[PDB]
C-alpha cells in the first residue's frame, strides 16, 4: 500500500520501489532475477573427459 505523498520506495537497500511512474502513477517493485551457481563434477582427467 502507498499514499499520494509517498511515491518513493526504499526499505533498507534503496531498492527501486520509488518508480511511482509519474507518466501513469504505477509503483513498481524492482528485484534482480536468479543469479545462479556453477560447479564441475568430474571423475578426473584420468578416467574420462
Amino acid at each position: 500500500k502507498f499514499l499520494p505523498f509517498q511515491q518513493f520506495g526504499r526499505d533498507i537497500a534503496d531498492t527501486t520501489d520509488a518508480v511511482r511512474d509519474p507518466q501513469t502513477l504505477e509503483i513498481l517493485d524492482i528485484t534482480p532475477c536468479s543469479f545462479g551457481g556453477v560447479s564441475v563434477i568430474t571423475p578426473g582427467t584420468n578416467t574420462s573427459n
Binding site: 500500500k1 502507498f2 499514499l3 509517498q6
Partner: protein
C-alpha cells in the same frame, strides 16, 4: 468577536519514528526526554528487556 490561539516554539531533536503496515505515523519517541527514551532509541526498538 471572540477567539483564542496558542504560541509555542520548536527546537531540533531526533526521535524514533514508527510506521505501521498501512504507512501512517503512529508511535514516536525522542532522545532528550527520559533515559528510557534514550536507551530505547539506541536499540532501535520500542521494547527493552532487563
Amino acid at each position: 468577536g471572540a477567539a483564542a490561539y496558542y504560541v509555542g516554539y520548536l527546537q531540533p531533536r531526533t526521535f524514533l519514528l514508527k510506521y505501521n503496515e498501512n504507512g501512517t505515523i503512529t508511535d514516536a519517541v525522542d532522545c532528550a526526554l527520559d533515559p528510557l527514551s534514550e536507551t530505547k532509541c539506541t536499540l532501535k526498538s520500542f521494547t527493552v528487556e532487563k
